[PDB]
Amino acid sequence: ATRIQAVYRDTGVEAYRDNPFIEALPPLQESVNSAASLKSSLQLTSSDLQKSRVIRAHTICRIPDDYFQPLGTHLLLSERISVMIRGGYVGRNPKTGDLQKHLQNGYERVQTGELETFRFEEARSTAQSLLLIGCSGSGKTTSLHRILATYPQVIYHRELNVEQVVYLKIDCSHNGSLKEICLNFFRALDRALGSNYERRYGLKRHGIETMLALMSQIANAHALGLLVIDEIQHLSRSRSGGSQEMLNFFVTMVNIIGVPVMLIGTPKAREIFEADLRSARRGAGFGAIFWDPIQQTQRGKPNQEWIAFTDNLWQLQLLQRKDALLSDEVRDVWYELSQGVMDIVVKLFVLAQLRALALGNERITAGLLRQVYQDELKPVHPMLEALRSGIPERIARYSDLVVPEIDKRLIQLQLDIAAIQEQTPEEKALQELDTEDQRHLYLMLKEDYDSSLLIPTIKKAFSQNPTMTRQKLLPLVLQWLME
Amino acid sequence: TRIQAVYRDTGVEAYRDNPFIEALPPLQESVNSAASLKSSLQLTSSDLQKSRVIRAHTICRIPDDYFQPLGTHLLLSERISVMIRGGYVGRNPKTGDLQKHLQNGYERVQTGELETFRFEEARSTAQSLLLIGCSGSGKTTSLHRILATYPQVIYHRELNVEQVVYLKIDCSHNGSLKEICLNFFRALDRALGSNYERRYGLKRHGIETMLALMSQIANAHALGLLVIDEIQHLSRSRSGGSQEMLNFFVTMVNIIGVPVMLIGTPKAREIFEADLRSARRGAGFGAIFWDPIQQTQRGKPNQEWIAFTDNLWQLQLLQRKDALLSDEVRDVWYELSQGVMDIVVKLFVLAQLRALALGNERITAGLLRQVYQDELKPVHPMLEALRSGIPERIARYSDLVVPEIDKRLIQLQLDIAAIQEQTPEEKALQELDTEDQRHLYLMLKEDYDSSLLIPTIKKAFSQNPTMTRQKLLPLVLQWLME
Amino acid sequence: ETMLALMSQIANAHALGLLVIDEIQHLSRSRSGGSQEMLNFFVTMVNIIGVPVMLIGTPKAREIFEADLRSARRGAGFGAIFWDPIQQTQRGKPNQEWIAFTDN
Amino acid sequence: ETMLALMSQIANAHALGLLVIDEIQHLSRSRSGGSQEMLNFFVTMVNIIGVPVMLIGTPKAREIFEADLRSARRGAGFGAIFWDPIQQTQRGKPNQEWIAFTDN
Amino acid sequence: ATRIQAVYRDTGVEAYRDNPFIEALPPLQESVNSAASLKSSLQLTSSDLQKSRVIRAHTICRIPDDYFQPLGTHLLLSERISVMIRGGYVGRNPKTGDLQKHLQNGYERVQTGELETFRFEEARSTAQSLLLIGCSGSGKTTSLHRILATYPQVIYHRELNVEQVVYLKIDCSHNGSLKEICLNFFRALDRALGSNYERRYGLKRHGIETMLALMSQIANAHALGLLVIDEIQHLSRSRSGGSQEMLNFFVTMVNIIGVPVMLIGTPKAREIFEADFGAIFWDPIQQTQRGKPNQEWIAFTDNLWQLQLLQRKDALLSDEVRDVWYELSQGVMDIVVKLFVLAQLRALALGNERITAGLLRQVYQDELKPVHPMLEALRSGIPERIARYSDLVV
Amino acid sequence: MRNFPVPYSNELIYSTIARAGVYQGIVSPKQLLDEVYGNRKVVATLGLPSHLGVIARHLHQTGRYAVQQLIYEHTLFPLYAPFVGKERRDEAIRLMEYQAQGAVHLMLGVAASRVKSDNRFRYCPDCVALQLNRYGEAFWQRDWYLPALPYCPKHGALVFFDRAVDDHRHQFWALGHTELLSDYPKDSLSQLTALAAYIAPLLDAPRAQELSPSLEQWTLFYQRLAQDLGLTKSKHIRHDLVAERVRQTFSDEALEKLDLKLAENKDTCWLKSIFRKHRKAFSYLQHSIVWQALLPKLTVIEALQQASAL
DNA sequence: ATACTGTGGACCAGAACCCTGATAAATGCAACGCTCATAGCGGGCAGACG
Numbered sequence A: 001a002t003r004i005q006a007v008y009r010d011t012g013v014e015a016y017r018d019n020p021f022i023e024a025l026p027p028l029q030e031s032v033n034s035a036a037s038l039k040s041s042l043q044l045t046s047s048d049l050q051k052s053r054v055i056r057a058h059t060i061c062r063i064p065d066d067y068f069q070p071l072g073t074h075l076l077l078s079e080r081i082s083v084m085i086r087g088g089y090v091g092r093n094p095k096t097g098d099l100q101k102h103l104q105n106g107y108e109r110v111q112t113g114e115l116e117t118f119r120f121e122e123a124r125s126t127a128q129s130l131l132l133i134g135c136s137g138s139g140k141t142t143s144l145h146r147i148l149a150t151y152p153q154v155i156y157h158r159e160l161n162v163e164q165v166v167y168l169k170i171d172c173s174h175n176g177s178l179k180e181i182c183l184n185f186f187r188a189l190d191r192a193l194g195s196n197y198e199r200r201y202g203l204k205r206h207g208i209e210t211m212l213a214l215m216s217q218i219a220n221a222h223a224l225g226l227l228v229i230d231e232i233q234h235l236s237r238s239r240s241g242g243s244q245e246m247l248n249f250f251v252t253m254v255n256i257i258g259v260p261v262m263l264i265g266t267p268k269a270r271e272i273f274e275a276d277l278r279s280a281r282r283g284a285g286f287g288a289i290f291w292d293p294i295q296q297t298q299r300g301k302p303n304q305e306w307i308a309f310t311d312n313l314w315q316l317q318l319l320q321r322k323d324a325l326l327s328d329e330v331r332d333v334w335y336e337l338s339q340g341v342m343d344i345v346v347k348l349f350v351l352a353q354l355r356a357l358a359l360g361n362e363r364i365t366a367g368l369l370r371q372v373y374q375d376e377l378k379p380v381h382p383m384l385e386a387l388r389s390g391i392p393e394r395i396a397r398y399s400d401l402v403v404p405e406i407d408k409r410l411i412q413l414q415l416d417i418a419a420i421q422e423q424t425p426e427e428k429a430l431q432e433l434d435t436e437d438q439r440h441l442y443l444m445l446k447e448d449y450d451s452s453l454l455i456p457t458i459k460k461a462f463s464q465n466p467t468m469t470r471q472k473l474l475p476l477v478l479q480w481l482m483e
Numbered sequence B: 001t002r003i004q005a006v007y008r009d010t011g012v013e014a015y016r017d018n019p020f021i022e023a024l025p026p027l028q029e030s031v032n033s034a035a036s037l038k039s040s041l042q043l044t045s046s047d048l049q050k051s052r053v054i055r056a057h058t059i060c061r062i063p064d065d066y067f068q069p070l071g072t073h074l075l076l077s078e079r080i081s082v083m084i085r086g087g088y089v090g091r092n093p094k095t096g097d098l099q100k101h102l103q104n105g106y107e108r109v110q111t112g113e114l115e116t117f118r119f120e121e122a123r124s125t126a127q128s129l130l131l132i133g134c135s136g137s138g139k140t141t142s143l144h145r146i147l148a149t150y151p152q153v154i155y156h157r158e159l160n161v162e163q164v165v166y167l168k169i170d171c172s173h174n175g176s177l178k179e180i181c182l183n184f185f186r187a188l189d190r191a192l193g194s195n196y197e198r199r200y201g202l203k204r205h206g207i208e209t210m211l212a213l214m215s216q217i218a219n220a221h222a223l224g225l226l227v228i229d230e231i232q233h234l235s236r237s238r239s240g241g242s243q244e245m246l247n248f249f250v251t252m253v254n255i256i257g258v259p260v261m262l263i264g265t266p267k268a269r270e271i272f273e274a275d276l277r278s279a280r281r282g283a284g285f286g287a288i289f290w291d292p293i294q295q296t297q298r299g300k301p302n303q304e305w306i307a308f309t310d311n312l313w314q315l316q317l318l319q320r321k322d323a324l325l326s327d328e329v330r331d332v333w334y335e336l337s338q339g340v341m342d343i344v345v346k347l348f349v350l351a352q353l354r355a356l357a358l359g360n361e362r363i364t365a366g367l368l369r370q371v372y373q374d375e376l377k378p379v380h381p382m383l384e385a386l387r388s389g390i391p392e393r394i395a396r397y398s399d400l401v402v403p404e405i406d407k408r409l410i411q412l413q414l415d416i417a418a419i420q421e422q423t424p425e426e427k428a429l430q431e432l433d434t435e436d437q438r439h440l441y442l443m444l445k446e447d448y449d450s451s452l453l454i455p456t457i458k459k460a461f462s463q464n465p466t467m468t469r470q471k472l473l474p475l476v477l478q479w480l481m482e
Numbered sequence C, D: 001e002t003m004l005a006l007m008s009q010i011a012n013a014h015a016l017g018l019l020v021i022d023e024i025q026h027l028s029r030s031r032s033g034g035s036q037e038m039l040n041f042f043v044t045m046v047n048i049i050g051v052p053v054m055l056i057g058t059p060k061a062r063e064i065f066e067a068d069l070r071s072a073r074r075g076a077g078f079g080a081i082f083w084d085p086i087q088q089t090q091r092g093k094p095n096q097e098w099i100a101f102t103d104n
Numbered sequence E: 001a002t003r004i005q006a007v008y009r010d011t012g013v014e015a016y017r018d019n020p021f022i023e024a025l026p027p028l029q030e031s032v033n034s035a036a037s038l039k040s041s042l043q044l045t046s047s048d049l050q051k052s053r054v055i056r057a058h059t060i061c062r063i064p065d066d067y068f069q070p071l072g073t074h075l076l077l078s079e080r081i082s083v084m085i086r087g088g089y090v091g092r093n094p095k096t097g098d099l100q101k102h103l104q105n106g107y108e109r110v111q112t113g114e115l116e117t118f119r120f121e122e123a124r125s126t127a128q129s130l131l132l133i134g135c136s137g138s139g140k141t142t143s144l145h146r147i148l149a150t151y152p153q154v155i156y157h158r159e160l161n162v163e164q165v166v167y168l169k170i171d172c173s174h175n176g177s178l179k180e181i182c183l184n185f186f187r188a189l190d191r192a193l194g195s196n197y198e199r200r201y202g203l204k205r206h207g208i209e210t211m212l213a214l215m216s217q218i219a220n221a222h223a224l225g226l227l228v229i230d231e232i233q234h235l236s237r238s239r240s241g242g243s244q245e246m247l248n249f250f251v252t253m254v255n256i257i258g259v260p261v262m263l264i265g266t267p268k269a270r271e272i273f274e275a276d277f278g279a280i281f282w283d284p285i286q287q288t289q290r291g292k293p294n295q296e297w298i299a300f301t302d303n304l305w306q307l308q309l310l311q312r313k314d315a316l317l318s319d320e321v322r323d324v325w326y327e328l329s330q331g332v333m334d335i336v337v338k339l340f341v342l343a344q345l346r347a348l349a350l351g352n353e354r355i356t357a358g359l360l361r362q363v364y365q366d367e368l369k370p371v372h373p374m375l376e377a378l379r380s381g382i383p384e385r386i387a388r389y390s391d392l393v394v
Numbered sequence F: 001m002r003n004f005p006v007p008y009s010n011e012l013i014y015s016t017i018a019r020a021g022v023y024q025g026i027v028s029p030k031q032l033l034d035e036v037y038g039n040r041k042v043v044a045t046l047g048l049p050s051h052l053g054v055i056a057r058h059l060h061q062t063g064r065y066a067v068q069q070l071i072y073e074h075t076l077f078p079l080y081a082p083f084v085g086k087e088r089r090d091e092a093i094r095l096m097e098y099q100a101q102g103a104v105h106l107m108l109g110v111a112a113s114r115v116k117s118d119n120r121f122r123y124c125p126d127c128v129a130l131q132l133n134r135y136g137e138a139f140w141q142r143d144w145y146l147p148a149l150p151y152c153p154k155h156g157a158l159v160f161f162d163r164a165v166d167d168h169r170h171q172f173w174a175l176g177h178t179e180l181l182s183d184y185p186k187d188s189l190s191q192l193t194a195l196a197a198y199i200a201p202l203l204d205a206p207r208a209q210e211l212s213p214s215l216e217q218w219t220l221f222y223q224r225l226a227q228d229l230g231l232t233k234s235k236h237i238r239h240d241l242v243a244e245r246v247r248q249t250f251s252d253e254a255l256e257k258l259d260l261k262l263a264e265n266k267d268t269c270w271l272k273s274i275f276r277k278h279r280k281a282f283s284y285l286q287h288s289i290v291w292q293a294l295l296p297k298l299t300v301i302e303a304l305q306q307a308s309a310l
Numbered sequence G: 001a002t003a004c005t006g007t008g009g010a011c012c013a014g015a016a017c018c019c020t021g022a023t024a025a026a027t028g029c030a031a032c033g034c035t036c037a038t039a040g041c042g043g044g045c046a047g048a049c050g
């Protein structure tokens, strides 16, 4: 409900010239840096290491939600969705006439006069209805949720008493129905607008045709930018009716409404639309941007995307016995462990720290990752090996699989972390020592030798001169050690 | 698309006072109609500096907007216009009250005053044309733009009729007759707003019943044309055999008027024409055979190839480009593409994308040879048969098509998108090569900024190579405090 | 039904005051169907649009509206006003209306 | 019987609270198949899930309609409220109810 | 619909030593504890006495729904129902191969359409029958909802896969048509179990002969314990040939199939039974048991009396109020509670906060008039005068 | 369905599905398929059934029965898994758990029966009495339905009567006690009974879960076994000892009852095809008869041990 | 010690199949039609007086 008054910027492109709907959108001149600025990450310092193990457990449990590293396909999706959004308003020009007036005027001018040739090709919808098919667990929903939220939803105009809804989101559920999408569109329009359209239009008495007929009216009345149907994978074919008639219903949806529409699905749902996809026919449309997991190798060498993501994710570790450099063996092993699927790669790293905080030594080993793999990836054993096989049928059959209820399992991990008796020697060292900003030198030089002499030496220097900066403290503690 | 009708006179005597002919765009000479079709991209002057991805999208958009007329298009346009405006003379809706005239003629014949009189005139058969050429020569892009001039749904207000001028049917891969019969209803109720498929196309009726209902449906609304594309899939498939494949297209005479058009690959001629009663219906109004253009005409270069390549050459988008085309590159195009029009633009697009990928940033013969040898593998037999020129060898391979080209284009776009950028401070990390360098880096971040930190680390190793990290630390800090 | 729903949408969009339907008598009873379903259509028409509606009909239309007019249930609506020809004798005396109209 | 057994599912899908049946006068004598059969219907209307019901009728309904103990005890399950017209003289004194109503 | 896993007991009687069905139930209880288990009352507490009037009115009105007291006969009824529901599982043992014979035979009756067809002569069935005739308003349905509520309804085993249903209750259709009893048996096993037997067995148009065998085999698909039939008087109102048809089918089921059945009805339904089993007759309570007043009446009156919710009340009861109750109600179990609730409601509403005999008389004569004519016959006591009407003692 | 019968010890799943419709008065053959699966196009198969997993979801609340136990212990799949190959054995389960039916017989390229050969319904005169006395029910058993030998491994010969699986494709039939079971004079070939007894223990043996010797392993094992005690000349097959052993232990009438004629005159004989390098799947009969002829004091499981180890 | 012959492994190619679409015929099943029993009704017959 960000009801900002329309400030009309000027775009130098001739097609977007003097359109009240388009100009209210944010400008696009440095959007490449804006598109690459989606990156977000937690801020971690060395201070959080000496905290109690429950605080570290909470910090680790907070990593999945607030970590995002843009990749190659995100730029392409951002540019394509920008093109679809901004090219969708060349038809519904409010200041001049609509499309039908333009065609009628063109016919009247080509009849007599000297307008020799007029092309009646017009616009197919207004942009192609993209179909973003990809394997489940790859990260489509979060990508759209972030790259589609940088546009204000409602631009309340002043001279025209209309609402410029820029985007929208339908979402099906488990064992859905064909009429449920039509009802949910009306229901979800209320949350975006604050009205009560369900009371007057959401009656169950209406047939399937009347729902689309009213949707056309309301979509024409409010200047609509996009309509993102999501999670077609959840639908059940037999409950709604004929499976092959779903394609007819979706084509009818695309034709009647007229605004750009973008569906989402999994390779299981591909067979519904495969009839139109195989043909190169213009008018079928439904262009597909295939989502694929991260590939390890490129031109016989490791792909830069994989290492770039791996190092960035590996910088978030707060292990006590941690070494600075990632070993190559684990780099080799977890890719074959997880096949590069975007969701589970992060999940294995999340669960590894929780398991290592309780099993004993605080480090990362290949056996630990293997143990986590047999622990909490049981439902996804078939799909992973199907991806390893490479046969399209094996991948298609085992799609839509997801691990249930990981969040509840995280809570019992934390509860088990809470109840422990024995302590590590480093825990003893940090507890007995005055670790109030004096800890940092000890931590940075702990691994050089045994700390038995180190614990009183730093105290001796610090009591010798209580007022020091750590910057001057480091040369002195280094000098007294070698003696 | 309900365009209202405004009439205009026509010079042709036969099309006197018939609304269907007179409600259409007026006659034009061939050269104007064959010259108004050309289109091209905008190519703004200063759009040579931008991000890689935007320019990549613009290059990927090239094949969909580049059209250039040639010699055959004018003849094709003339034939299409004659077929569309020559099948409407039998059906003139504007007729005076003929009961009185017919009864008066009957009375004068019966009473003996007259001797002869023609009571009712019935139509006979229909015109038909077949257009065959090797695949990739442009038998559908050159048909979606010739037919773009004619409006599809003209509405008559004085009467109550809708003039569906042209309708496009495309057979599927299976090649069964019932698919064509149902696809007719699909296309027709997609053109208008209706539900003809459920009202007529039920499972209850057999093939003959839908074939007879198409006549009633095509007389209720005034059709003008019916083009069938990709007829090569009806050659030898599970359509009941070649005998019934011939019989169905012969029995398609019963559809009232509506001059049909058949498009197919050169292999379909042998299967489709083997009986006298069917070939004369196939080539009922001519039989035009398309063929790819050639470099020479008669001991001298052909001008159409020169114009096509030269006009295509300016449309490229690169930082440094040679505007003046060198003849060697043109000879390379004629050696690789060999003439088929589909491959000519695809080679250019793929070469440009790979040129942006490598950073060579120039179009040369070597890049063209590399991309041709890398990507366009399956099309090789057709080109190698084209080189020889033997009719049987060229006829053997005239059905090959390159798959997955869109997926390859998208993957190439991802490849050029994933280039990223390296800031000098980030590049300083890559400057460190030995693992000990990176370890000392990682321990010594918090106290010192990287800009001063990296140099004193590097001279530490450049001065004393073989000396350990804990022993390295004092000398580094000695450099640092000063 | 789609016509009715879109009619309701349009009538809500524009400020519509009155909707008068004229000469119900001329509607054919053959291709229309049952008088019961015609009555159902009119009842649905009254409710859906949401603006007051005025109907004009012959006394034969009272046969169609026999079912809905007998009921005294609230919410049915359809108040009836009966046009009659000019009567002469009221209270045993000739009417003034006829005399005045006849003279004029 | 199928309709009665089918009402319960809908009366439990939506938490129905009260169901008032008025004008019970018309069911005293008609082609209902039998007075005792219709009384059996009104007493087998117990299988509907809860949903307390209120019945309204003229004093002609009482004597004819409740003439059996098993159905009488279900009619007055929560007291049978009886109504009467206003009385002018209560006990030789004018009623304030009548005076107030007439004056207002 | 309370799905409960089963854990077995170890019974003492040798006849029940093997079955899982009879070893899955909660144990039968001695008559000493059974009387105390049945009783329930209201929470009361004196904190509500000084609360507002409206908040007190609903608490007063909640008396008849949450107040049950065990009388003398219910302790016999509980024992008899326990014995008659335990004696119907010794002939359908699945461990020693007896349910398989009792279930295989039922397919043959479905095939041929006759209920006397038998394949295994070794299959023996044990079952019992009862009828519970009592005057209307005597609270016989609530007794069969509180005695038969100790046993859980659906218990799920794990060695087998049988989902045993312990008890099921149906109501005969008002017309008594021979198809709707069979169509309503598939609508109690349809809700107590959460299935759709009705769609697969009722919509397909079958004859009554096959629909009768489908019931008798589906009832043995599970382990049905008790099929108690309420409201049996409607059976007399059916068409010709049906009055005896389901007085012979309901004895065929007990004798041959082996599912115990108990019938509950009003006194005017005794004629069809006698138009030609243990009989228990229920009568309205009376104070004049032999030569001295009965103790049950006094105990029940005191127990109900201690539930008053009036700010100024007489704590001790007077005998005149008891005589007024017995002369205005005649002891039928429905009138007393409603009369007391109405009297104290009127007392609360008027302003006079204490119950008196005059207020009881006024409320009884002003608010319970549709009930007076029948109570005149009960009050008179003349056998010929009380013989008229229906639903009265005979 | 709410009450799906648990399979008895060592029976086929077809009789279990039949008793799942005998127990609830379902007599229309369409309704049984409508309720058990939900599709009217599902087929009825004796041995190597498909659509399993739907039959296990009904038994899910019982924690014991799963897909692997159902396929290995309650089908005829144990006879084909060890001998054909390891990878095909491992992929048969994933091909069979789902709705695919046509590929099941094709991929295990041994089920080209064409016309239904001895797919008449079979039972045993003496076993039914024991099943009656210990259970009270009669059912189809895996011991009776050996693919080739029409002999009960313990005793006697099976009682053929006249019906077939192709008589009704969409019908599951349970054995009827009231359907008369008439005895006939036992005409038994003792060698066939001995072979059935020898091959019986492989059906219920835990170690056949994963042991499938490879093709090359089969070739090396057979060459070494032939050369151990002198069944092969110097780079040549003796052709005499192999014939005289099998003619000593087996007579010709047993071979014609098994339809496995030897052809010493003709060059193409299955015995010579076995000893040559293997390239296609082989039936259990040929391996069993070779094992019985070459060495008569070794069990099937330990025979597979020696075959697979070296 | 090399030409002659068996021989095992690798290899052409016709053939049973068998899968699928186009068309006619048997058929189960909601869709009215029918039957049965039940309660009020207006022309007809006995009646009856001036």
Ligand SMILES: Nc1ncnc2c1ncn2[C@@H]1O[C@H](COP(=O)(O)OP(=O)(O)OP(O)(O)=S)[C@@H](O)[C@H]1O
Pocket: D070, E064, E065, E067, E068, E069, E070, E071, E135, E136, E137, E138, E139, E140, E141, E142, E265, E333, E334, E337
């Ligand atoms: N022994 C009892 N103790 C307490 N309250 C009782 C007792 N018997 C009956 N009641 C009450 O009386 C009412 C029971 O009446 P119902 O449940 O209608 O049974 P019923 O109406 O007698 O059965 P019918 O007439 O054969 S349908 C409830 O309000 C009970 O609280």
Ligand SMILES: Nc1ncnc2c1ncn2[C@@H]1O[C@H](COP(=O)(O)OP(=O)(O)O)[C@@H](O)[C@H]1O
Pocket: A064, A067, A068, A069, A070, A136, A137, A138, A139, A140, A141, A142, A342, A343, A346
């Ligand atoms: N760059 C990223 N960093 C961390 N997690 C990511 C990233 N991209 C995607 N994810 C993961 O993807 C998950 C959501 O995507 P997903 O569930 O596959 O979409 P859908 O619900 O449509 O299948 C999130 O749990 C998130 O952890």
Ligand SMILES: Nc1ncnc2c1ncn2[C@@H]1O[C@H](COP(=O)(O)OP(=O)(O)O)[C@@H](O)[C@H]1O
Pocket: B063, B064, B066, B067, B068, B069, B134, B135, B136, B137, B138, B139, B140, B141, B142, B341, B342, B345
């Ligand atoms: N006149 C033309 N100029 C440039 N390109 C053309 C022309 N005609 C066709 N094409 C190219 O051919 C492609 C379409 O080929 P198409 O006509 O589908 O081949 P076919 O007729 O064999 O199906 C388009 O991508 C377009 O770029």
Ligand SMILES: [Mg+2]
Pocket: A141, A231
């Ligand atoms: Mg999702």
Ligand SMILES: [Mg+2]
Pocket: B139, B140, B229, B230
């Ligand atoms: Mg084409």
Ligand SMILES: [Mg+2]
Pocket: E141, E142, E230
């Ligand atoms: Mg009751």
Ligand SMILES: [Zn+2]
Pocket: F124, F125, F126, F127, F152, F153, F154, F155, F156
């Ligand atoms: Zn046996």
